[model samples]
Target: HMCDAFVGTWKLVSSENFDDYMKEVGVGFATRKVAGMAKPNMIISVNGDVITIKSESTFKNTEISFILGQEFDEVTADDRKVKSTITLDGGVLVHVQKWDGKSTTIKRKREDDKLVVECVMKGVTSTRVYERA
Candidate 1:
């Protein structure tokens, strides 16, 4: 597993197609507006069996953690209840989050010039391609 590539801090760069994605996830219009107005912070760390991700913004702070390949209950930054699982697919790291009666899978890939994060929930999805901070 190329999980090592995900270790470290990353800042949210410009996101493409996120506004629509958030809308589909049932995020209110106001919340989506606020999300678009501010930058989000993403921090991920892995140690042996444990992996953790913290996404912070002015409006909320969301964190999730679990042992590799295990399921755990967590509260999202928006205070939504969720069950999450993370595993390595090939060399890419992926996370599946079940929340609000829906499931979303986020895939991470390290390309030549950027780190790509794709969140797919319901029928809507968003991809945020970022560079190192």
Candidate 2:
């Protein structure tokens, strides 16, 4: 469906509720300050059976390559290592990070010309919007 539309370089235009979300996720003040001032660069590419998503900003850059239903290892933005998996449902790309029986989830998709990303954990949700670049 809309998976074909996800291929692009995305730049964050806005981040809402990130601070509270960061606190619950265990990120420290200094790191959260940097994150507040800078949003991660997001890039997506597809090759038939798999898709690669890359995120970066300033000193750090991370990448993930996955297919629907496949599970793998992940180190979260807050530095927690966890077992993770990403799936495609409808036109949305979904990610779940599991550790210590607790989990976090994110969903991303294209809405017109924007790449909308949403993250949820411990009943808190943060939303970041990106424009195709």
Best by lDDT: 2
lDDT comparing candidate 1 with the true structure: 0.78
Give the per-residue lDDT of model 1 (tens digit) for 69-130: 88888776545688888888887778888975788888988887577899887777788876
TM-scores, one per candidate? 0.87, 0.92
In terms of lDDT, the poorest run of 10 residues in model 1 is 1-10
Write one digit per residue (lDDT tens) for candidate 2, span 35-94: 778777899988887888898888468888887789989776667898888888888889
User: So what's the TM-score on candidate 1?
Assistant: 0.87
> Which structure among the candidates has the greatest TM-score?
2
